[PDB]
Every structure is written in C-alpha cells, then in structure tokens.
Amino acid sequence: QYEALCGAYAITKQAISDAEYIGDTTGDPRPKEVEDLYIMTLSDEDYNEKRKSDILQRRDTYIHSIPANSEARAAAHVAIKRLFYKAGNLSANIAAAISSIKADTRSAGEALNRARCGQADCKAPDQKWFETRSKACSGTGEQKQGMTIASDISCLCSAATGETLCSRGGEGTAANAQTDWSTTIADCDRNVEGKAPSPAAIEAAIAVFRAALGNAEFTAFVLAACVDYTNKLARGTINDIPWIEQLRTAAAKLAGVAGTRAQLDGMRQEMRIIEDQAWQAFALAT
Amino acid sequence: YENAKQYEALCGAYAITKQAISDAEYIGDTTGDPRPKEVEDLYIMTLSDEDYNNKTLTGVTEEGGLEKRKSDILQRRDTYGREIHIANSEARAAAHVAIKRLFYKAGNLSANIAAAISSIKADTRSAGEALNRARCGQADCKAPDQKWFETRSKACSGTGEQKQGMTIASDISCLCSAATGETLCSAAATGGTYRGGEGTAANAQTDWSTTIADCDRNVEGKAPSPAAIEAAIAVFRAALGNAEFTKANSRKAFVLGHGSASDCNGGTSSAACVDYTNKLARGTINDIPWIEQLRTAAAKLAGVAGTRAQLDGMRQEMRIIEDQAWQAFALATIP
Amino acid sequence: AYENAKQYEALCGAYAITKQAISDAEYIGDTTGDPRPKEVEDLYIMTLSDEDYNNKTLGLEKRKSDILQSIPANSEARAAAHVAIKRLFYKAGNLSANIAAAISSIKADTRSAGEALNRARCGQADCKAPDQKWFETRSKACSGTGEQKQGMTIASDISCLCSAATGETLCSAAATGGTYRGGEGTAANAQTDWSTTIADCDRNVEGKAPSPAAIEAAIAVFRAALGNAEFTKANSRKAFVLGHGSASDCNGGTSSAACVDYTNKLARGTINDIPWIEQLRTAAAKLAGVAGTRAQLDGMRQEMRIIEDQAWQAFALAT
Numbered sequence: 001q002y003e004a005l006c007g008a009y010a011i012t013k014q015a016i017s018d019a020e021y022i023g024d025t026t027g028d029p030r031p032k033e034v035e036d037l038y039i040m041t042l043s044d045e046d047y048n049e050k051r052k053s054d055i056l057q058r059r060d061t062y063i064h065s066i067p068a069n070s071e072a073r074a075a076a077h078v079a080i081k082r083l084f085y086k087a088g089n090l091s092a093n094i095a096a097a098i099s100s101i102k103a104d105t106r107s108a109g110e111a112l113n114r115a116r117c118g119q120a121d122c123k124a125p126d127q128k129w130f131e132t133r134s135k136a137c138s139g140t141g142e143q144k145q146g147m148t149i150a151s152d153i154s155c156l157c158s159a160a161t162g163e164t165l166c167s168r169g170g171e172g173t174a175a176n177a178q179t180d181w182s183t184t185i186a187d188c189d190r191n192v193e194g195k196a197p198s199p200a201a202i203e204a205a206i207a208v209f210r211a212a213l214g215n216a217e218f219t220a221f222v223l224a225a226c227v228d229y230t231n232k233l234a235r236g237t238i239n240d241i242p243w244i245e246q247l248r249t250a251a252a253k254l255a256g257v258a259g260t261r262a263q264l265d266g267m268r269q270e271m272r273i274i275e276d277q278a279w280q281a282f283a284l285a286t
Numbered sequence: 287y288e289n290a291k292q293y294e295a296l297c298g299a300y301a302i303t304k305q306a307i308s309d310a311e312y313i314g315d316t317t318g319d320p321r322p323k324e325v326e327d328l329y330i331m332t333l334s335d336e337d338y339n340n341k342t343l344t345g346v347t348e349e350g351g352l353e354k355r356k357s358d359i360l361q362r363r364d365t366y367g368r369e370i371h372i373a374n375s376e377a378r379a380a381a382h383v384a385i386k387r388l389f390y391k392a393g394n395l396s397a398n399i400a401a402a403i404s405s406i407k408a409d410t411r412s413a414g415e416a417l418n419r420a421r422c423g424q425a426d427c428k429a430p431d432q433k434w435f436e437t438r439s440k441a442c443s444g445t446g447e448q449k450q451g452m453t454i455a456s457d458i459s460c461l462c463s464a465a466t467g468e469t470l471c472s473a474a475a476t477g478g479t480y481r482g483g484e485g486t487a488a489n490a491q492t493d494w495s496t497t498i499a500d501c502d503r504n505v506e507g508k509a510p511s512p513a514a515i516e517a518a519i520a521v522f523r524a525a526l527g528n529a530e531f532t533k534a535n536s537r538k539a540f541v542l543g544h545g546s547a548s549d550c551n552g553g554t555s556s557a558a559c560v561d562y563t564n565k566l567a568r569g570t571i572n573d574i575p576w577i578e579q580l581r582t583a584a585a586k587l588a589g590v591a592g593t594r595a596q597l598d599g600m601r602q603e604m605r606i607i608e609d610q611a612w613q614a615f616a617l618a619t620i621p
Numbered sequence: 622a623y624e625n626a627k628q629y630e631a632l633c634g635a636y637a638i639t640k641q642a643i644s645d646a647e648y649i650g651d652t653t654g655d656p657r658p659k660e661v662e663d664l665y666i667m668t669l670s671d672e673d674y675n676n677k678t679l680g681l682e683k684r685k686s687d688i689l690q691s692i693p694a695n696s697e698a699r700a701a702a703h704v705a706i707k708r709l710f711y712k713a714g715n716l717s718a719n720i721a722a723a724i725s726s727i728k729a730d731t732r733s734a735g736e737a738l739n740r741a742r743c744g745q746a747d748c749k750a751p752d753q754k755w756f757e758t759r760s761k762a763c764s765g766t767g768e769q770k771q772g773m774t775i776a777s778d779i780s781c782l783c784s785a786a787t788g789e790t791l792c793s794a795a796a797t798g799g800t801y802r803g804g805e806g807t808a809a810n811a812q813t814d815w816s817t818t819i820a821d822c823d824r825n826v827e828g829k830a831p832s833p834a835a836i837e838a839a840i841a842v843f844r845a846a847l848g849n850a851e852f853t854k855a856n857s858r859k860a861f862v863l864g865h866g867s868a869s870d871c872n873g874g875t876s877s878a879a880c881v882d883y884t885n886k887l888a889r890g891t892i893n894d895i896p897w898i899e900q901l902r903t904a905a906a907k908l909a910g911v912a913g914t915r916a917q918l919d920g921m922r923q924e925m926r927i928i929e930d931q932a933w934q935a936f937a938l939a940t
C-alpha cells in the first residue's frame with residue numbers, strides 16, 4: 001500500500017506561508033496623507049514636530065498648505081477628524097485581524113506538525129513518535145492506537161513476510177522504528193514541492209485514507225498488518241483517531257484565514273477610499 | 287464484517303443530508319443592511335422650515351412613526367460632552383441634494399441588499415430540499431415512514447422497474463438487510479424484513495430505524511459544504527465493486543456488495559447488494575438519483591457564497607455612504 | 622470486459638473539462654463603470670476656469686453646450702472647486718486605465734488557461750480536428766520502451782488504456798480500439814481508434830464552467846485509478862501504472878497490455894509531472910488569477926462611482 005501514509009507526510013510537511021495571506025501591508029497603516037492633512041487643519045494653537053517639514057514639501061510633481069485660518073479650517077477639521085479616527089480605528093482592526101490569522105495559521109501548523117511529529121519537535125526524530133507494537137499498533141493493554149502519521153508506518157511495514165508492501169508483534173521496536181523511519185522516508189520526502197496547505201487537500205487526503213481502510217487477514221475498519229484501529233475507534237467516526245482529528249483541527253483554523261481575507265481586503269479598500277475622501281475635504285477650507 | 291466500507295460511504299452521504307443549513311450562516315448581520323439612520327437624520331436637517339412638518343403627507347420618507355423624531359433627532363449622544371446633531375443658509379439647501387443623492391442610493395442599495403438576501407433564502411431552501419430528496423423521496427424528510435423505499439426487486443437488483451439509487455435509504459436498506467446476518471453494515475445489521483424480492487418498502491421501513499442508529503449518533507454539529515458533498519461521492523465511488531454476478535447486466539463497479547451473487551433481491555449475505563447497471567447507463571455514478579440531488583444541493587451551496595460576497599460588498603457601500611453624508615453635512619456649517 | 626472503466630472515467634473527467642469553454646466575458650460586469658465617468662468630465666468643464674475655458678491646448682464649445690439638459694460663474698470655486706475636481710478627475714483617469722489593464726490581464730489569463738486545457742487534451746493549444754500529432758507510438762505513449770513521451774496528452778493515454786486486440790467493451794461503453802495493437806504505435810492507428818473510443822465523453826460534457834477546484838478534483842479521481850499491482854520487472858513501479866494487471870508490456874495485444882507505465886517518464890514520484898496534469902495545473906492556476914483580478918476590477922469600479930459622488934460635494938461649494 002504505502003500511498004496515503006507518505007501523502008499525509010507531504011501534507012504535514014507542507015509550508016504555512018502567512019505572507020501569502022496577509023498580502024499588501026502597504027495600505028494597512030493609517031494613510032500618511034490623512035495624517036498630514038489633519039495637522040495642517042489644526043487651527044492656530046495645536047499646529048504650533050519635525051514632520052511639518054515633510055509636509056509643505058515634496059510636491060512630487062515639481063502638496064500641502066496651511067489653509068485659511070477661518071472657521072473653514074475647523075469646519076474641514078471636524079470632517080476629517082472622523083476620517084482620521086476611522087483610519088486609525090480601522091488599522092487596529094486590520095492589525096488585530098492579522099494577529100488572528102497568524103495565530104490560526106501557526107495553530108494549524110502545530111496541528112499539522114502534531115499530527116505527524118510529537119507536539120512540535122519534528123526537527124529531530126523523537127523516540128516518542130514510535131511506540132510499542134501491542135498497545136500502539138494493536139492497542140490491547142492501553143488504547144493508544146494510530147497516534148501519528150509515522151506511528152502507523154511501523155506496523156504493516158515491519159516484522160517479516162513483506163516485499164516492501166508498505167515502503168515485533170507484541171514487543172517494542174522503538175529503535176527499529178527509528179531505523180525503519182529512515183528506510184520509510186527514503187520512499188517519501190519527495191514532497192509535492194510544498195506549495196501551500198489547503199483545507200480541500202486535507203479532506204482529499206482524509207478521503208483517500210478512508211479508501212485504503214480495509215483488510216481481510218486474521219487477528220472491519222482495519223488496514224500480517226497489526227493495525228486494527230477498532231481498538232480506539234470507540235464509535236465508528238475517525239473523529240476519535242488522533243491524526244485525523246489533528247488534521248481536521250488544522251483545516252478549521254485554515255478555514256478562518258479566507259474569512260479574514262475577505263474582511264481584510266475590504267478594509268484596505270476602505271482605507272484607499274478614506275484617502276480620496278480626505279482630499280475633497282481639504283478644499284472645504286478653500 | 288462484509289459490507290462495512292459501503293455503509294461508511296452511504297452513512298457519510300446521509301450525514302450531510304442530516305446536517306442543517308441555517309440561513310443566517312450566510313446572510314449574517316442585518317443591522318447595517320438597511321438605510322443608515324444617520325443619513326436619514328441628516329436629510330431632515332437640510333430641509334429648512336418648509337417641507338419640515340407632519341403635514342407633508344404627500345411626501346414623507348419614513349415618517350409613519352408620526353414624525354415626532356423630526357425634532358427629537360437632535361440628541362446629545364457623545365463623549366463626556368455633547369456635540370452631535372442644524373441655520374438656513376444657501377449651503378443648507380446645497381447640502382440637501384448631496385445628501386439626497388446618497389439618500390436615494392442608500393435606499394436603492396437597501397432594496398438590492400434585500401434582493402440578494404431573498405436569493406440566499408431561496409437557494410438554501412432549494413438546496414435543503416435537494417439533500418432531503420436524496421435521503422428520502424421528498425423535500426421534507428420527516429418521518430422514517432410513508433414508503434420512501436421500493437420493492438427489493440425494483441430497488442436493489444433493478445429487475446422489474448429500474449429504481450436503484452432512488453434514496454440513500456433504499457441503498458442503505460438493500461445493502462444492510464438480508465437473511466444472513468453479521469456486523470455487515472453496522473453493529474445491529476441483520477435486516478430480516480427486507481429479504482425477499484417481493485419484500486416491499488414497508489419491510490424496509492420496519493428494519494430502517496434499526497441499522498441507521500450509528501449514523502444518527504455520528505452526524506456532528508457542522509454545516510454542509512460543497513467539498514463535503516464531493517467528498518461523500520469520493521468515498522462512495524471508492525467502495526463500488528463486487529467481482530461476481532450475472533455476466534450481462536453485471537457491469538460491476540456499479541455493484542455495492544460482495545461475493546458470488548447472481549441476485550441482490552435474495553437472502554444470501556451476498557445479495558445484500560445494489561446493482562446500478564440498469565440505471566447508470568450513461569456510464570457515470572453521478573447518474574444515481576441521490577448523487578444528482580447531492581450535486582444539486584452542493585451547486586446551490588456554491589451559489590450562495592457568491593451572493594454573500596455581493597451582500598458584504600453592498601454593506602461596504604452603505605457604510606461609506608454614511609460617512610459621505612457627514613461630509614455633505616459639513617457644507618452647511620459655513621458662515 | 623469493462624476492466625479499465627474506473628481508469629477510463631478518471632481520464633474522461635479531465636477530457637470533459639478540456640472540452641469546456643471559459644467564456645472570457647463571464648468575468649466582466651459591464652462597460653459602464655469601466656470608462657471614465659462623463660459626469661466628472663462634465664463637472665470638470667463647469668468649473669474649468671474662464672481662461673483656458675475654450676482654449677484647447679492641442680470641440681470644447683460643443684461640449685460646453687452639450688450640458689444643455691449650473692453656471693460656470695467666475696468665483697473662487699471656479700478655481701477652488703476645479704482643483705478638487707482635478708484631484709478626482711485624474712484619479713478616475715488612472716483608475717479607468719488600471720481597469721483596462723485588469724480587463725486585458727483577465728483576457729490574457731483566460732486564454733492561457735484555455736490553451737493549457739487544449740494542450741493537455743491534444744498536445745497543442747488548437748484542438749481543431751483529430752490529428753496524428755496528438756498521439757505517438759506505444760513505445761513512447763504507453764510502455765515507455767524507447768522514448769518517454771508518455772503522458773503527452775490525455776488523448777494518448779486514453780488510446781493506450783482503451784485500445785488493444787483482446788478487448789470486449791474494455792471501456793467507453795462501446796467497442797475497443799482494434800488498430801493500435803502493440804509495437805505498431807501507428808499514431809494514425811490511434812487516430813482510427815479515437816472517435817469510436819471517445820464518444821461517451823462527448824456526452825458527459827455539461828455546462829460546468831471550467832473551475833480551479835474541478836481540475837484539482839479530477840486529478841484526485843485519476844490518483845485513485847492509478848494502479849496495477851502485478852505488472853512486471855525492474856522499473857515497473859506498480860502504483861504508477863494504469864491497466865487491468867498481470868502484464869509485461871503496455872499497449873500490446875492483451876487487454877491487460879492496455880496500460881500506461883509512467884515509470885520512465887515520471888520522477889520523484891510526483892504525478893503532477895505527467896504532461897497533461899501539468900497543463901491542467903497551469904490552467905487551474907491562471908483561472909484562480911482570473912478570480913483575483915476580477916475582485917480587483919469590481920473594487921476599482923466601486924471607487925469610480927464614489928469619485929463621481931465626491932464631485933458634486935466638491936462642486937456644491939460653488940453655490
């Protein structure tokens with residue numbers, strides 16, 4: 001077999017790229033113009049920073065002025081005061097939304113890693129990744145079945161009677177599994193160029209796993225073999241078996257990045273709108 | 287122990303049909319959808335003494351609340367101080383048309399916003415009817431009764447009248463009901479009633495809410511997703527196969543069963559099968575009646591996502607219309 | 622009998638998407654908001670000063686009388702509302718230019734996507750009529766014995782998988798190709814074994830607009846069907862074969878021989894390296910970029926309409 005096992009390894013060894021979701025970062029801060037225009041409309045008390053220098057210069061053609069010190073300067077100010085506040089109070093929402101995405105992506109990254117490696121220590125092959133071959137692949141004494149992606153490449157790919165079909169029944173092959181990890185990866189780690197994670201790719205891998213579920217050897221939701229996920233299955237759902245649940249939790253956090261993406265793009269457009277709104281309000285002060 | 291994977295596929299499809307599509311999961315918040323009260327309140331301001339009265343009955347905007355608020359709009363809702371919310375300069379009149387332009391546009395958008403909501407309401411209910419039409423033979427799917435199955439001969443083997451795939455239940459009933467019993471489909475999977483070729487849909491109903499137990503305990507608190515429908519078909523097509531049958535009209539890969547059969551309208555454990563060759567003529571699994579309804583529901587669930595994008599965009603225009611109204615209101619505050 | 626249909630249907634789904642039209646106009650809304658709003662151009666002349674008001678710097682009088690069904694009075698706003706309109710005027714001027722580039726970017730992206738679909742089905746971006754250039758020899762298209770032009774086209778893999786001597790409705794619900802028999806690659810014989818084999822797919826086509834997800838979905842369908850666990854000797858990776866089973870060659874005489882052994886063409890175990898899936902991915906990627914550019918297009922149209930609203934607010938100062 002050995003098809004969904006290495007496939008899930010590539011999906012767990014994908015690359016979460018926060019930058020490909022956050023995107024612009026240029027319109028996210030409060031537009032400099034709605035801040036420069038604001039100061040020039042501060043009447044004759046608050047205006048009198050080293051930033052007044054950048055304003056009233058850099059015409060960019062070959063841009064700003066102190067308007068009439070009448071009520072129109074304050075009349076324009078109260079118009080842009082909300083425009084100034086709206087950008088600043090929207091940039092915080094954009095920044096908070098970015099932190100939501102960054103938390104979700106890494107959390108989905110942790111779930112993707114914790115699905116394969118232990119916690120997040122996949123930099124080196126911990127021995128806790130692989131367990132005994134009676135309580136982890138058979139689950140007799142303790143119900144510790146099918147824990148990780150690599151916790152299943154031990155059974156059906158160790159012991160005897162196999163012509164690399166999956167490229168110590170009862171005992172623990174922890175070190176042999178550590179060696180079998182090197183042999184197994186050699187038939188893997190090709191990756192898929194690590195393009196990006198996708199919630200559909202997790203469901204597709206999950207669905208592909210459900211296809212290979214089944215075997216007609218001697219001791220129903222199984223994959224000799226020594227797998228028998230029915231040990232910890234409890235109710236038939238794979239929502240109990242660990243690595244499927246960890247993959248699903250990662251998809252749930254990854255599902256939220258698109259929702260914040262639609263919110264985030266529209267908020268940036270509003271900032272671009274608030275720029276154009278402000279210039280047509282500086283004319284209020286003639 | 288025999289037809290376990292096939293049940294897992296059908297139970298997966300049943301799960302989505304048992305899932306509910308709440309309308310508000312797509313419509314969302316509607317407190318900002320209507321015409322903003324700020325742009326309305328600003329419109330009463332730039333009106334002068336004339337046209338500002340209850341007796342303007344010939345033209346009234348939303349003054350069915352007997353006006354009243356016309357003079358009470360000038361409130362004091364601010365910070366520790368009171369600032370917000372009208373003389374009668376030429377700027378007052380010149381600001382009215384600027385508000386009137388956005389006052390119209392906000393109201394038009396409110397109608398357009400409501401129009402997109404009605405599209406979502408219709409599509410979701412139309413989609414909801416489709417999922418039901420797969421689980422039952424109706425758009426309601428209420429009582430596990432009322433004969434939404436058919437005879438064994440017609441529904442499982444397609445001998446008399448080609449009626450395979452009519453409902454996900456019929457395919458579940460045929461696959462999990464035979465004389466020979468085991469943990470074939472589920473734990474309590476014997477299905478003794480629906481055994482003979484003459485076995486009517488009543489027999490299936492009598493052993494329906496006994497083999498469907500695990501499925502209803504496994505439907506989780508999620509919502510149907512168009513990928514979930516396509517996923518449900520993927521596990522279904524993966525399980526379709528039984529290399530043993532009746533030669534002609536035995537196109538396998540269209541058989542949901544096991545072992546030598548020669549029939550699926552019988553008592554043998556093997557006859558716990560459904561041959562679709564007599565319905566899947568075109569050659570596609572997607573021609574099974576509950577597959578099309580699954581795809582019909584998934585298609586409608588993709589349509590509401592786009593209308594949601596239109597709905598969200600309209601509320602953005604409404605909100606920036608509210609801000610632009612204050613800009614036009616600042617025209618009047620000129621000496 | 623039908624012994625490759627599970628493999629055939631996966632290939633037929635891809636052929637269905639390639640035989641589908643993207644309709645370059647479905648991703649555009651209208652040519653109303655795209656051009657510069659004439660009202661802003663109209664309001665430009667109502668405050669276009671009194672000098673340069675009819676001085677066309679190489680007409681203006683016809684446009685100044687065009688406004689017939691307020692007054693271009695010489696006040697401050699005649700030069701104090703023009704500046705606000707000027708700021709808006711060229712902002713919408715660049716915006717409509719960017720809109721035109723976005724439309725051209727969409728059209729170029731859809732054509733490149735549509736070319737890729739034709740490239741996967743046929744080998745060229747012009748799927749006009751069945752040509753011998755579409756297929757190649759068994760040695761190349763199916764068995765990989767002599768050259769590695771294996772996954773060139775879906776059309777060659779279909780002809781390799783659904784054509785052999787021994788074959789009763791091997792797939793396609795009607796007949797089996799009887800000329801592409803063994804070393805006789807005869808790409809012309811694969812052309813004779815084409816219209817008979819491909820007629821079911823020319824009925825499975827529907828009004829399903831070519832979508833990025835459907836292309837990735839059909840690839841998953843092919844992934845499931847990719848397998849032949851018996852096959853033959855070294856460099857015969859059994860997971861990367863598409864056939865009945867228990868063979869030693871591909872496209873020979875046996876129905877089993879109707880197989881495609883990508884082992885020689887494939888590398889790093891990535892099916893996303895067979896020619897047709899590559900093009901399918903290229904088409905899917907470009908189609909996604911169409912969605913992104915269309916999202917920009919509607920956003921730009923939104924900014925143009927608000928610019929026109931700002932024009933009156935700027936122009937209302939002249940009263």
Ligand SMILES: *[C@@H]1O[C@H](CO)[C@@H](O[C@@H]2O[C@H](CO)[C@@H](O)[C@H](O)[C@H]2NC(C)=O)[C@H](O)[C@H]1NC(C)=O
Nearest residue numbers: 060061062707708710711712713714715716718
């Ligand atoms: C894009 O917007 C800019 C905004 O300035 C336009 O630039 C002006 O174009 C007018 C055209 O008659 C010239 O007279 C000005 O000298 C330009 N000013 C500057 C600062 O560039 C420009 O025309 C717009 N369109 C394009 C294609 O650039």
Ligand SMILES: *[C@@H]1O[C@H](CO)[C@@H](O)[C@H](O)[C@H]1NC(C)=O
Nearest residue numbers: 081082083085086088089090
């Ligand atoms: C924006 O936030 C400031 C405080 O940071 C607050 O004083 C102001 O009222 C807010 N205005 C808006 C429009 O949100």
Ligand SMILES: *[C@@H]1O[C@H](CO)[C@@H](O)[C@H](O)[C@H]1NC(C)=O
Nearest residue numbers: 389390391392393394395397
């Ligand atoms: C819709 O727009 C038209 C434009 O003439 C306007 O007369 C009408 O009042 C608008 N709708 C509403 C509900 O205001």
Ligand SMILES: *[C@H]1O[C@H](CO)[C@@H](O)[C@H](O)[C@H]1O
Nearest residue numbers: 288466467553554555556
């Ligand atoms: C299913 O039922 C048949 C007929 O009784 C039996 O022969 C098989 O052994 C069983 O699995």
Ligand SMILES: *[C@H]1O[C@H](CO)[C@@H](O)[C@H](O)[C@H]1O
Nearest residue numbers: 544545546547554555556
């Ligand atoms: C399916 O049923 C047949 C008898 O029809 C039996 O021989 C097989 O063992 C069973 O799987």
Ligand SMILES: *[C@H]1O[C@H](CO)[C@@H](O)[C@H](O)[C@H]1O
Nearest residue numbers: 622787788789875876877
């Ligand atoms: C190819 O399939 C045919 C069916 O027509 C069978 O007769 C052969 O044995 C097989 O190789």
Ligand SMILES: *[C@H]1O[C@H](CO)[C@@H](O)[C@H](O)[C@H]1O
Nearest residue numbers: 865866867875876877878
């Ligand atoms: C495929 O063709 C081989 C040729 O030997 C035959 O043995 C198999 O029975 C058939 O399916």
